[PDB]
Amino acid sequence: EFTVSTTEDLQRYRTECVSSLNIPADYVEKFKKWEFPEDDTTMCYIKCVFNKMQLFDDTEGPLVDNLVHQLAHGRDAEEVRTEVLKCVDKNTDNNACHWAFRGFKCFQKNNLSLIK
Ligand SMILES: [Cl-]
């Protein structure tokens, strides 16, 4: 049973991902200011966060219904689903880090935030 992540849930997941991926201090300061370089360090960090939020599976990819519940923030569920589906694609370059990051960049482009 999926449940929406709070701001506190997300802060914890980011902390856990920084620790478990041994993310260097300079990347943590970039992420804090919503700067996400297009390197494997950043891409695997985003995958880790999305994994913990149950928004992404390394084999199945983006978890569409879970994403709609998380990202809607009081918007129309059908409108948000249409937006999410436009950002959902196949694992064409066989890389779950690249895959999760691509979706994230698409969500950002379309002003879909994890927290309002
Ligand atoms: Cl994030």
Swiss-Prot record:
Tissue occurrence: High-level expression in female mouth parts, particularly in the proboscis (at protein level). Moderate-level expression in female antenna (at protein level). Expressed in testis but not in the accessory gland or ejaculatory duct (at protein level). Expressed in spermathecae (at protein level). Female salivary gland. Female chemosensory organs: antenna, palp and proboscis. Not detected in midgut.
Any GO BP: sensory perception of smell
Cellular location(s): Secreted
Glycosylation sites: N111
This protein's GO CC annotations: extracellular space
Molecular function, one GO term: odorant binding
Positions that bind (5Z,8Z,11Z,14Z)-eicosatetraenoate: R14
Keyword list, A-Z: Behavior, Disulfide bond, Glycoprotein, Secreted, Signal
Induction remarks: (Microbial infection) Up-regulated in salivary glands following dengue virus type 2 infection.
Phenotype on disruption: (Microbial infection) RNAi-mediated knockdown results in reduced probing propensity, measured as a percentage of mosquitoes that probed within the 400 second period. Increased probing initiation time.
Disulfide bonds: C17-C48, C44-C97, C87-C106
Residues at which (9Z,12Z)-octadecadienoate binds: R14, Y45
Binding-site positions, (9Z)-hexadecenoate: R14, Y45
Chain's role: Involved in modulation of blood-feeding behavior and capacity in female mosquitoes. Required for normal oviposition. Required for normal fecundity and fertility of female and male mosquitoes. Required for normal expression of VGA1 gene, which encodes the egg yolk protein vitellogenin-A1. Involved in regulation of spermatozoa development. Required for normal female longevity when mosquitoes are maintained on regular sugar meal. Binds long chain fatty acids. (Microbial infection) Facilitates shedding of dengue virus type 2 particles into mosquito saliva. Does not affect dengue virus type 2 replication or infection prevalence in midgut and salivary glands at 14 days after blood feeding.
Record note on quaternary structure: Monomer in solution.
Family label: Belongs to the PBP/GOBP family.
Name of the featured protein: Odorant-binding protein 22
Residue range from the parent sequence: 17 to 132 of 138
